[PDB]
Structure 1
Amino acid sequence: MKRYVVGISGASGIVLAVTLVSELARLGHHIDVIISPSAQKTLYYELDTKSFLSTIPQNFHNQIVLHHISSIESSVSSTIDATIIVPCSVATVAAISCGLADNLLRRVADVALKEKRPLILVPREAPLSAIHLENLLKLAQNGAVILPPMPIWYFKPQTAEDIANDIVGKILAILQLDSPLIK
């Protein structure tokens, strides 16, 4: 029974976080989830709800703890098998690359780097400027896994859901879990 921290930042593609958290729980693990106010908006615009938990089957709720973005005092903010920021806005990328650990989402990423525990970042921004590429580079040189949501067309997806599933499968493979989402 592994323990994961999933930080959800306000970039497009919150379905990726929904799918990842569902599958992590369906495989029996524990997830601490931190939703930023911008991801809260993205949740409404992209998935038509204001409750992240309503997107997750109810029997898995005892495996998910929501933490408020301001709780830098929380016990995730100080053991954890991996931390995943998905989706990850370039503003959150910039903060983590600076060390600017002044909310809980940014703190859990800094803690993963400080303890050399896995930190997977799923940035979504296009086009990518030189400023953002330099922050991404700096994070990769400090051991962050940089995993943009790149569709895998040789699995010949038919639906949008297929494309999301295969992207989450790649996150799970980086996490070294066996999931049927991995092709």
Structure 2
Amino acid sequence: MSGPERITLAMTGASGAQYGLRLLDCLVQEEREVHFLISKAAQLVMATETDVALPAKPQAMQAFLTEYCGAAAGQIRVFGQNDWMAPPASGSSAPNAMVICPCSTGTLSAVATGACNNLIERAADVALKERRPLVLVPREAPFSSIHLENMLKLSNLGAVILPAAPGFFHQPQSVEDLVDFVVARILNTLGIPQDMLPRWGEQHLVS
């Protein structure tokens, strides 16, 4: 298998819940183990932007997402926001890649400053210290200098700042096509196969 066996997928409270749900679906279909984290604010975004009725508590949420995605038993773990006994909280855990999608400006701030106030922020702190993959998918416009400084600091360390800024070069025909563009870029970053976005120029040879 190419790419990580396990991904920590954190959803935080930026607009674009569709991106995180699509990414979750794609990771499940690629037979990956997902350690799923979601902030309080992200639950309110999901309720506002989608007709996904996500249960609030981790055990109900795990059962719901397992069904929603057609996952295997055990494939989606869900951990609460203060569950320090979960793998992502320690660098002595088995290695995971981590994606924060969507990434609110507040979570971006916390990761850049090392705040570690909940399991998402601690998980990202652990990824950075252990040199494990960390991809942040912010959705905001305009970006202020506060945002940009935080992104720059993290990019300089080795985090991938991948804004939810879909391209139009494969003639998207629906909202789903644009969502799939960004999810494809995340999967490409992680080194996980995807067939939503072709390999640009693969067949080109000269000119």
TM-score normalized with structure 2 length: 0.84
Structure with bigger helix share is 1
Match of 1:91 in 2: 106
The answer to whether the 8 A contact 2:101-2:136 is kept is yes
Q: Which of 33, 38, 49 is residue 36 of structure 2 equivalent to?
A: 33
RMSD: 1.5
The answer to whether the 8 A contact 1:173-1:182 is kept is no
Separation (CA, whole Å) in 1 of partners of 2:175 and 2:73: 26
Q: Which runs of 4+ in 1 moved over 4 A?
A: none
Separation (CA, whole Å) in 2 of partners of 1:145 and 1:114: 15
Give 1:74-89 correspondences, 5 Å limit: 74-78=86-90, 79-89=94-104
Q: Which of 180, 190, 199 is residue 175 of structure 1 equivalent to?
A: 190
The answer to whether the 8 A contact 1:151-1:167 is kept is yes
TM-score normalized with structure 1 length: 0.94
List runs of 5+ in structure 2 lacking aligned partners. Answer: 55-60, 199-207
Q: CA deviation at 1:60?
A: 4.1
Separation (CA, whole Å) in 1 of partners of 2:182 and 2:73: 23
Q: Which amino acid aligns with 1:100?
A: A
1:73 aligns with 2:85: yes
The answer to whether the 8 A contact 1:26-1:60 is kept is no
Q: Which of 19, 24, 30 is residue 21 of structure 1 equivalent to?
A: 24
Q: Which amino acid aligns with 1:105?
A: I
Deviates more, 1:116-125 or 1:44-53: 44-53
Q: CA deviation at 1:100?
A: 0.6
The answer to whether the 8 A contact 2:28-2:69 is kept is no
Separation (CA, whole Å) in 2 of partners of 1:47 and 1:60: 24
The answer to whether the 8 A contact 2:28-2:71 is kept is no
Give 1:26-175 correspondences, 5 Å limit: 26-51=29-54, 53-54=64-65, 56-60=68-72, 62-78=74-90, 79-175=94-190
Q: CA deviation at 1:23?
A: 0.7
Greater Rg by CA = 2
* Identical pairs, percent: 38
Q: CA deviation at 1:70?
A: 1.6
